[PDB]
Amino acid sequence: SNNLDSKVGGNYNYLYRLFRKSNLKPFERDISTEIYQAGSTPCNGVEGF
Amino acid sequence: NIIRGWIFGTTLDSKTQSLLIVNNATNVVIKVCEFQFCNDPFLGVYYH
Amino acid sequence: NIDGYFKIYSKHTPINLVRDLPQGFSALEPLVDLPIGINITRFQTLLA
Numbered sequence: 001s002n003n004l005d006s007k008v009g010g011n012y013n014y015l016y017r018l019f020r021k022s023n024l025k026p027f028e029r030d031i032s033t034e035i036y037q038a039g040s041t042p043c044n045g046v047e048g049f
Numbered sequence: 050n051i052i053r054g055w056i057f058g059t060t061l062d063s064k065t066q067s068l069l070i071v072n073n074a075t076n077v078v079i080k081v082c083e084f085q086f087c088n089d090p091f092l093g094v095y096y097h
Numbered sequence: 098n099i100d101g102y103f104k105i106y107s108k109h110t111p112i113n114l115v116r117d118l119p120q121g122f123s124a125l126e127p128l129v130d131l132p133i134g135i136n137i138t139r140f141q142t143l144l145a
């Protein structure tokens with residue numbers, strides 16, 4: 001779809017989920033925007049280390 | 050006709066999606082959204 | 098809730114019982130199947 005979807009600076013309107021605690025089930029859909037914890041620390045608000 | 054429907058989901062407070070199924074007085078309605086549900090959710094009637 | 102499909106089976110029967118689940122047998126027919134695709138871990142019924 002490069003001739004439809006691509007744009008010279010990049011069509012950043014297409015998103016994928018980079019992080020998830022566990023792999024999702026067959027035909028499951030997840031719409032949460034909530035911050036992923038990669039550290040052993042808990043994390044709150046908009047961001048953290 | 051006291052029992053009229055169910056919530057199904059995980060967070061139930063719009064952190065995630067959830068399912069509503071309701072049989073309200075005129076129609077059945079089924080809906081899947083990021084719902085913010087009540088603590089004591091119900092449907093209510095003016096009596097006699 | 099199987100592989101993103103939410104499956105509802107149901108039955109209705111007339112009764113005359115005061116305060117228990119009636120002792121007997123009858124099977125539920127498959128009513129509807131809904132392609133909702135969302136984790137369910139909890140539920141809550143809605144009273145009138």
Ligand SMILES: *[C@@H]1O[C@H](CO)[C@@H](O[C@@H]2O[C@H](CO)[C@@H](O)[C@H](O)[C@H]2NC(C)=O)[C@H](O)[C@H]1NC(C)=O
Pocket residue numbers: 021022023024025059136137138
């Ligand atoms: C659906 O949601 C539940 C609850 O959010 C997930 O189970 C949680 O998973 C983490 C990691 O194993 C635990 O720390 C929580 O205590 C669990 N809670 C419950 C109620 O299970 C479950 O993994 C989710 N299912 C899918 C397929 O993502």
Ligand SMILES: *[C@@H]1O[C@H](CO)[C@@H](O[C@@H]2O[C@H](CO)[C@@H](O)[C@H](O)[C@H]2NC(C)=O)[C@H](O)[C@H]1NC(C)=O
Pocket residue numbers: 073074075076078
């Ligand atoms: C039962 O609930 C549905 C919604 O679940 C109500 O439907 C709405 O009705 C208004 C007025 O006609 C419309 O403007 C909305 O767009 C409708 N939305 C939906 C989702 O149907 C319906 O009115 C309710 N019925 C009763 C008797 O309360």
